[PDB]
Amino acid sequence: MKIALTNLPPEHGERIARLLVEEHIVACVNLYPVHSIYSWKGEVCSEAEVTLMMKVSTQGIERLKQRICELHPYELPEFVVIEVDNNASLREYIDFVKGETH
Amino acid sequence: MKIALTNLPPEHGERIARLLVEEHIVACVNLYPVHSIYSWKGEVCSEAEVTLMMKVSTQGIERLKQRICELHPYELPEFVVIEVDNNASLREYIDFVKGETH
Amino acid sequence: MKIALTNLPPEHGERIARLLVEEHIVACVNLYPVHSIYSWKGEVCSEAEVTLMMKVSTQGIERLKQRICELHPYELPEFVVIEVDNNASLREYIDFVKGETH
Amino acid sequence: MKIALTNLPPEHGERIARLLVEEHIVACVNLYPVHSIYSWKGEVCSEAEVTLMMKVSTQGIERLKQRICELHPYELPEFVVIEVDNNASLREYIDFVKGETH
Amino acid sequence: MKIALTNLPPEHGERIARLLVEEHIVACVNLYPVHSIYSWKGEVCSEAEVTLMMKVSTQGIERLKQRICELHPYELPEFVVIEVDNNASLREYIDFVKGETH
Amino acid sequence: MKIALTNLPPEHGERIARLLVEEHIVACVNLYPVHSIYSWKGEVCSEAEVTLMMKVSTQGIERLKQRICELHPYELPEFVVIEVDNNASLREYIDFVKGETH
């Protein structure tokens, strides 16, 4: 399995997280609000966002990336994938994540 | 060192995080609330949870996993381990984490 | 690219996050509050902190570590670097992070 | 002006807040996530919710109540009006809140 | 009804809230984490706390105050009652709050 | 005592709160992040802000208002005073709030 992150305006975060679970593209999402500061086209931007921490099988990652890009309101969305130490994690939890990712 | 994640109902999060530090199974825990959406036995579940981001030596991970499973109220708890780039991290901070993990 | 974490008292979190983006040492920071429990010099410490989740090019990490250490109010600050699965992430987002990291 | 409070599931909180601002039923809304513990039909319930702290003109309250009852997903919604000390508050802020409310 | 506020250390906030709901001393509690900055014995204090926003019937307030003073870990606890506009609030919500309070 | 509310950009919320406590203009401040949706000059605005829930003595309110207007970065700042039921609240807490306010 892996963890994937994106950030969404709070309008869309929950909607999109819900869809991803309904469509079984991810097993589980944690959402929490966040304050983002970034450089964009020569300016320091400060925004209210929600982070989606998404739990998906390692092979379901490509499909997730595709879907995020379809649904995401930003020209250039964040999609950052983090590697999980699968063998140090709880075996039955990874198996669960794999099972719910169709 | 590594980072480990679990999610707990807010009732147990703080209690369990406190124990793990008192028993020196982890060096440090960050707790923050989270909204979780996941698939479970054919249903979309939506819950209030607290994420525990736990900082532990690389070899203390097995013991942490065992302890989490003993204390965790869920049939199938989340326990996800994330690999840390140890050499790009601050050396003295990893040494601290190692030292507090007995 | 990589993700880097530190935790700061809420007094300094925002200030420091802002500087790092203005100085183009990181592309983007997400800040969120956190409750931290850790062992320090024989005692269980409980504090209000803010987590800075920082997005930086893989080679800009050394400079970030140096800067964090210059600005951070703690004797021993947290600086934890997490490896990103660059090829499973969105290519154009990594390119963006690289571009904003001077 | 007055402050009104409601709690919504995260899936509806942001959507509904947005609408109330756009329709000029409230001047401003502050949303923040919350863990709700409540008694309901003989069960202790524990939910992820988002609080909407709404700023509205005194004369706009009944419309807000009406609209909240229309849009709210719950059978029995929360609508709680908090008493503002209008003389002690800042005049220009109250005026702003009056001017954005219809 | 009225709203009552207190702040607790995270280790006690969730436990205490749960009790007050179970004992039917409050109908509902919303908890959310908070950073507290306060003056105490000549020191500026900075703490992680969790706010409990409690819904109780008017006649239930003194019991709530009494129970808060019994359970609260602090020498001098916070107990602040906020004035609800009962006529402008939703009747059925107030009634619900009355019915869950003893 | 009374409760006063304002909202600030995250870059100023913590700094300003700290000052008001140090100068003994408020006894205590609770800060928490918030997503603000508000109407402003014909635009629906969506911002990251931090709420300051401030505890002050009744006679200290005007100074607090004055100081908030001085320090606040916004042209038109939020300053909203919430009505506390002083008899129903805990006497010793009110007294503490009076004693820390000048």
Q: How many residues in total does chain A contain?
A: 102
DSSP state of B92: H
DSSP state of B73: -
Instruction: Name the pairing type of β-strands B80-83 and C2-8.
Output: unpaired
Tokens describing residue D8:
């919504």
Tokens describing residue F28:
């205590």
**Facing residue for E37 by CB, picked from F18, F85, F89:** F18
Tokens describing residue F9:
């950009």
Tokens describing residue C17:
């996050």
Query: Can you tell me whether residue C90 is helix, strand or coil?
Result: coil
Q: How far is E88 from chain B (nearest CA, A)?
A: 30
Alpha carbon distance C65, D62 (integer Å): 55
Alpha carbon distance E77, E53 (integer Å): 15
Strand partners for E5: E53, E80
Q: How far is F26 from chain D (nearest CA, A)?
A: 15
Q: Report how many Cβ contacts below 8 Å link chain A to chain C.
A: 79
Asked if D18's CB is within 8 angstroms of A14's CB, the reply is no
Tokens describing residue C34:
């956190």
Asked if D14's CB is within 8 angstroms of A10's CB, the reply is yes
Alpha carbon distance F100, D55 (integer Å): 30
User: Would you say B85 and C1 are in contact if contact means Cβ atoms under 8 Å apart?
Assistant: no
Among candidates E22, C76, E37, which has minimal Cα distance to F16? Answer: E37
How far apart, in Å, are the Cα atoms of C70 and each of C28, C65, D57, E61, F97? Answer: 19, 9, 49, 51, 38
Burial class (CB in 10 A: 0-12, 13-18, 19+), C15: middle
Alpha carbon distance A20, A5 (integer Å): 13
Alpha carbon distance A22, A15 (integer Å): 11
Alpha carbon distance C59, C65 (integer Å): 11
B21: which chain E residues are within 8 Å (Cβ-Cβ)? none
Please name the residue that has the structure tokens 């008493």: D83
Alpha carbon distance A22, D82 (integer Å): 38
Extract long-range pairs of A70-74: CB within 8 Å, 24+ residues apart.
Answer: A71/A12, A71/A16, A71/A19, A72/A6, A72/A8, A72/A12, A72/A16, A73/A8, A73/A9, A73/A12
Query: What spatial distance separates the first Cα and last Cα of chain B, rounded to whole Å?
Result: 13
- D near C: at least 3 beta-carbon pairs less than 8 Å apart: no
Tokens describing residue C95:
């390119």
Which residue in F has a C-alpha nearest to residue E39's C-alpha? F27
Report the interhelical angle of F10-22 vs F61-71 (nearest 10°). 140
User: Would you say A16 and A58 are in contact if contact means Cβ atoms under 8 Å apart?
Assistant: no
Query: Can you tell me whether residue F99 is helix, strand or coil?
Result: helix
Among candidates F25, C40, F94, A54, which has minimal Cα distance to F17? Answer: F25
Extract long-range pairs of D66-75: CB within 8 Å, 24+ residues apart.
Answer: D67/D20, D67/D23, D67/D25, D68/D4, D68/D6, D68/D16, D68/E90, D69/E90, D71/D12, D71/D16, D71/D19, D72/D6, D72/D8, D72/D12, D72/D16, D73/D8, D73/D9, D73/D12
User: Would you say C36 and E33 are in contact if contact means Cβ atoms under 8 Å apart?
Assistant: no
Establish how many alpha carbons lie within 13 A of residue B54's alpha carbon, considering only the half-sphere containing its beta carbon.
35
CB count, 10 Å around CB of D16? 22
Q: What is the resolution of this structure in A?
A: 2.5
Please name the residue that has the structure tokens 């679990």: B6
Instruction: Name the pairing type of β-strands B28-40 and A80-83.
Output: unpaired
Asked if E81's CB is within 8 angstroms of F92's CB, the reply is no
Residues 6+ apart with CB under 8 A from E10: B14, B31, C35, C46, E33, E48, E49, E50
User: Would you say C94 and C18 are in contact if contact means Cβ atoms under 8 Å apart?
Assistant: no
Among candidates F7, D34, A87, F64, which has minimal Cα distance to B65? Answer: A87
Alpha carbon distance E77, E82 (integer Å): 16
**Facing residue for F93 by CB, picked from E35, E39, E76:** E76
Alpha carbon distance D8, F59 (integer Å): 36
Asked if E27's CB is within 8 angstroms of D36's CB, the reply is no
Give the amino acid at B21. Answer: V
Q: How far is B3 from chain D (nearest CA, A)?
A: 25
Alpha carbon distance B28, E12 (integer Å): 19
Tokens describing residue B97:
């984490």
User: Would you say C77 and B90 are in contact if contact means Cβ atoms under 8 Å apart?
Assistant: yes
**Facing residue for D30 by CB, picked from F34, F44, F65:** F34
Among candidates E67, E61, E59, which has minimal Cα distance to E82? Answer: E61
In DSSP notation, E32-72 reads EEEEEEEEETTEEEEEEEEEEEEEE-GGGHHHHHHHHHHH-
Establish how many alpha carbons lie within 13 A of residue C66's alpha carbon, considering only the half-sphere containing its beta carbon.
6
B33: which chain D residues are within 8 Å (Cβ-Cβ)? 33, 35
DSSP state of A1: -
Asked if F49's CB is within 8 angstroms of D29's CB, the reply is no
C100: which chain A residues are within 8 Å (Cβ-Cβ)? 38-39
Q: How far is A14 from chain F (nearest CA, A)?
A: 14
Alpha carbon distance C1, C5 (integer Å): 14
Which residue in F has a C-alpha nearest to residue D28's C-alpha? F38
E-strand spans in C57-94?
Answer: 80-83
Report domain extents, chain F. Answer: 1-102
E-strand spans in chain C?
Answer: 2-8, 28-40, 43-56, 80-83
**Facing residue for B84 by CB, picked from C7, C32, C81:** C81
Q: How far is C16 from chain E (nearest CA, A)?
A: 18
Secondary-structure percent of chain A, ordered helix, strand, coil, rounded to 5: 35, 40, 30
Which residue in E has a C-alpha nearest to residue F1's C-alpha? E80
Among candidates A97, A15, A81, A84, which has minimal Cα distance to A50? Answer: A15
User: Would you say E6 and E69 are in contact if contact means Cβ atoms under 8 Å apart?
Assistant: no
Which H or E element spans position D29? strand D28-40
Experimentally, the structure was elucidated by: X-ray
Alpha carbon distance F69, C89 (integer Å): 46
Alpha carbon distance B96, B99 (integer Å): 5
User: Would you say D37 and D46 are in contact if contact means Cβ atoms under 8 Å apart?
Assistant: yes
Which H or E element spans position F9? none
Which residue in A has a C-alpha nearest to residue B39's C-alpha? A27
Alpha carbon distance F95, F92 (integer Å): 5
Which H or E element spans position B31? strand B28-40
Burial class (CB in 10 A: 0-12, 13-18, 19+), B102: exposed
